[PDB]
Amino acid sequence: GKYSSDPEWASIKPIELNDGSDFGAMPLATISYSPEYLEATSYLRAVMAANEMSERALRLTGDIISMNPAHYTVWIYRAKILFALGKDLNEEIEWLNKVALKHLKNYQIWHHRQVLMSSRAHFPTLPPREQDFLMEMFAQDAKSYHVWTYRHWLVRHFKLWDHPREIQDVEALLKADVRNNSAWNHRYMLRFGPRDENEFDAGLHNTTGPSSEKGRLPVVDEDLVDSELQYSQSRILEAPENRSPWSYARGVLQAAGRPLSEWKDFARSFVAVKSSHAIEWLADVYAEEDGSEGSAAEAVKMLTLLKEKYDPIRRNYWEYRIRQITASAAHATEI
Amino acid sequence: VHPGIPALFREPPLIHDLLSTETTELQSETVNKCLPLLKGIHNSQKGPFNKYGIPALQRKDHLEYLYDSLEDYPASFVALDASRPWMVYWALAGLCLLGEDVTRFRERVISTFTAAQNSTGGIGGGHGQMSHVASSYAAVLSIAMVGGEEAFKLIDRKAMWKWLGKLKQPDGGFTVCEGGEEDVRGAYCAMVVHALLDLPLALPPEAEARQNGLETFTDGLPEYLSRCQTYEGGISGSPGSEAHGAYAFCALACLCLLGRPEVVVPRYMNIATLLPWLSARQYAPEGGFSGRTNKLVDGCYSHWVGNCWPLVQAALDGTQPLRSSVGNLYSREGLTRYILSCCQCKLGGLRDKPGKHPDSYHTCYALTGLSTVQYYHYCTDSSVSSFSSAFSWKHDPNFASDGQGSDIGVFTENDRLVPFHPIFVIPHKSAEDIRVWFENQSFDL
Numbered sequence A: 001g002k003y004s005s006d007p008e009w010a011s012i013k014p015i016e017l018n019d020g021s022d023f024g025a026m027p028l029a030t031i032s033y034s035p036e037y038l039e040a041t042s043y044l045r046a047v048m049a050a051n052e053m054s055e056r057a058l059r060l061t062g063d064i065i066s067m068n069p070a071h072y073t074v075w076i077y078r079a080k081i082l083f084a085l086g087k088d089l090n091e092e093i094e095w096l097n098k099v100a101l102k103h104l105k106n107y108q109i110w111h112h113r114q115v116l117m118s119s120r121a122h123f124p125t126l127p128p129r130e131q132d133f134l135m136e137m138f139a140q141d142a143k144s145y146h147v148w149t150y151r152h153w154l155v156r157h158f159k160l161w162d163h164p165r166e167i168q169d170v171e172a173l174l175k176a177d178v179r180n181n182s183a184w185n186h187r188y189m190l191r192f193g194p195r196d197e198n199e200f201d202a203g204l205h206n207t208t209g210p211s212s213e214k215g216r217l218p219v220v221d222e223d224l225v226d227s228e229l230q231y232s233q234s235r236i237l238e239a240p241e242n243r244s245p246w247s248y249a250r251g252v253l254q255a256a257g258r259p260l261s262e263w264k265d266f267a268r269s270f271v272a273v274k275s276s277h278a279i280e281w282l283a284d285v286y287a288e289e290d291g292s293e294g295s296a297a298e299a300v301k302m303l304t305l306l307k308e309k310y311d312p313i314r315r316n317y318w319e320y321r322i323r324q325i326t327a328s329a330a331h332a333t334e335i
Numbered sequence B: 001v002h003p004g005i006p007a008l009f010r011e012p013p014l015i016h017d018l019l020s021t022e023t024t025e026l027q028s029e030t031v032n033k034c035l036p037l038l039k040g041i042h043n044s045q046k047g048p049f050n051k052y053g054i055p056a057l058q059r060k061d062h063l064e065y066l067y068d069s070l071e072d073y074p075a076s077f078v079a080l081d082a083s084r085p086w087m088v089y090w091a092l093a094g095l096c097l098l099g100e101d102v103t104r105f106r107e108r109v110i111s112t113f114t115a116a117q118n119s120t121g122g123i124g125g126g127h128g129q130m131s132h133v134a135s136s137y138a139a140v141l142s143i144a145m146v147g148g149e150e151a152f153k154l155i156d157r158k159a160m161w162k163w164l165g166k167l168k169q170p171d172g173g174f175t176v177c178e179g180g181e182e183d184v185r186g187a188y189c190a191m192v193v194h195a196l197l198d199l200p201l202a203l204p205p206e207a208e209a210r211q212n213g214l215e216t217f218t219d220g221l222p223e224y225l226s227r228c229q230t231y232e233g234g235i236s237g238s239p240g241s242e243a244h245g246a247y248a249f250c251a252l253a254c255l256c257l258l259g260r261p262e263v264v265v266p267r268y269m270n271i272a273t274l275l276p277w278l279s280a281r282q283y284a285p286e287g288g289f290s291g292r293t294n295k296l297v298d299g300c301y302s303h304w305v306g307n308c309w310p311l312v313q314a315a316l317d318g319t320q321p322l323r324s325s326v327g328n329l330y331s332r333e334g335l336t337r338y339i340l341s342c343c344q345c346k347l348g349g350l351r352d353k354p355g356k357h358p359d360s361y362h363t364c365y366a367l368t369g370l371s372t373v374q375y376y377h378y379c380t381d382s383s384v385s386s387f388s389s390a391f392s393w394k395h396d397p398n399f400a401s402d403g404q405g406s407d408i409g410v411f412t413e414n415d416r417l418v419p420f421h422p423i424f425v426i427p428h429k430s431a432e433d434i435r436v437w438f439e440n441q442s443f444d445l
């Protein structure tokens, strides 16, 4: 055994695996671990029990990660050691990049990155090639949930909402694939996400208010809103059945306290139907913001197009909307 | 092609953009793989095909797959080391769904989790792994399913309470382990463990979160979950992240552990945006649910998205006294077609989608979703608890249908599974029995 024969390791006795297979009934879903993994993990048990913060323990964590990067315990213990020993975290990040590139789907690696990067003593400002590394990840999987979550954290931590690479990288990803919802979601954070450092993080403004008003901005930059809506329309015209920019625009209008009817004519231009989202948009405009006679019937017509032709799998939801509108109209008719 | 299959499940959508991107390439490929299976004409499919053109649930094949999944794995499966408690849960859950008595696994469950419990509290992936809320959730649910005083006694409740108290964060949420990530899955798993073991609501007297003005496990929690809603209407894993079906389930189920659905859900979530986003998870012709906007259907979301529906529907209907209902606001027919026509592997097990090998995670959650469509699940004014609302959920069968319709049961009664609790994701009796047993034990000194 590598560890058991190494004089570097002589001073500590490993703790052997107790899986339950010896005392009583047979355990379930067992794994016949390799001898190398059994030995390394027996030494890990021993060093963690001793709370050992050492160079040998650090190497051991690296070895275990090479065999199993999905071992959540070893990553947490590794971070403890790095901080306890005052290790160079720039070098740890360069190593972590290599592990990340080998295991694209691994999320433990990305929590570890956040833990390291959060240390202002080591990383007082955004490292100069950090955004490029995130783009090397997105070039391989543009919707990676853990990498996007890390990038959200990074923006809040280094206050990057107006940093031009955040918007540029979103725009490069949306040029490559305008249907990348993860990039749209990050765009919303950049443009409309709450920034008050004295408040807990939130996806939307106004979470202390009534839930129907969630997202409402306390102060609206009207020119920014116009610009973002223009951008959304431009992207929609490239691929009108793409849900992402329509949902983004609804979020923008909600944040701004503006009505869906600001886009009535735009939505009508897709109606011969080029976008089911345009139909749903009109349904809501006619049902919720138009108080004129006949508007409720038109909303019902739009929802009937959706249930019969343009998005029929959601028929029960469309029918629920029709029922709501019909009840509302009947209430209006009686008052 | 069988006459019982509507055109909706046999053709791609009517509207098709000219612009090709990676998203549409993958979406097209997925539709093309599903279509022969939806039509029931793929040579991999086993009958009998019912009047709606859908193959039987292959119960014996799945049983054998799930029993096999509880035995030994070779060295190559080392990455599953930290997931061993999940593997036990996914298998026992699938076996229960399929109508097996899992009592005979009591001793083996005890043997498995005894070594995985840490003296300082909680359960981790196995001997020497730190306690983790997901391992602890999987272990508690497994213990609930097998039942018995001996399995219940395995857990050190006081140590579990002390350890869970260490995970409570100033912002109201929970980390998944000490030094680990904070996300809504962490909050949901922690609170399920807390509820099923009847832990004290107060934080331990020395919990660090008390320095931040918090007093109980639920202090600041629904506010935290509200801050995870996104502009899309869905709910993300942590604030500002992307709306995702798995986290919507975690957050909605967690809210329903805090009070009645019709009180808590509309208070902390904007239902006006949540409802259409949840509805938009379902695609045709596939019939199944995707987890996020512009991504692909996957049979595991039959649970994560599917079981959001009884929660949201209860928020709209209100508590039923022991009356009309909004009904089902998604297509049970589509989901059933996706699971039975597309997600069954000929050799046993269920899968994410055609082209994927089965695994026990996908087997557990596709079956859990199939069970959902077969029941009315609703909450009542009658609780087994002495989290009151969470223990008030009851069920009635939603029987197999005849004829066409917008809200129909296209499984056969031969395909009927055991009902699962929509919050606890185990049978109602299993959740009831564990909670009541712990309610009747004094908290350890």
Ligand SMILES: CC(C)=CCC/C(C)=C/CC/C(C)=C/COP(=O)(O)OP(=O)(O)O
Binding pocket: A143, A144, A145, A146, B134, B185, B188, B189, B237, B244, B246, B247, B250, B290, B291, B292, B295, B296, B298
């Ligand atoms: C109780 C509990 C543990 C709940 C959580 C369960 C759930 C599966 C968590 C993960 C969700 C999310 C980050 C998936 C993205 O993976 P993906 O990109 O591979 O999948 P996608 O394309 O479907 O989004």
Ligand SMILES: [K+]
Binding pocket: B134
């Ligand atoms: K997990």
Ligand SMILES: [Zn+2]
Binding pocket: B298, B299, B300, B301, B352, B362
């Ligand atoms: Zn899946």
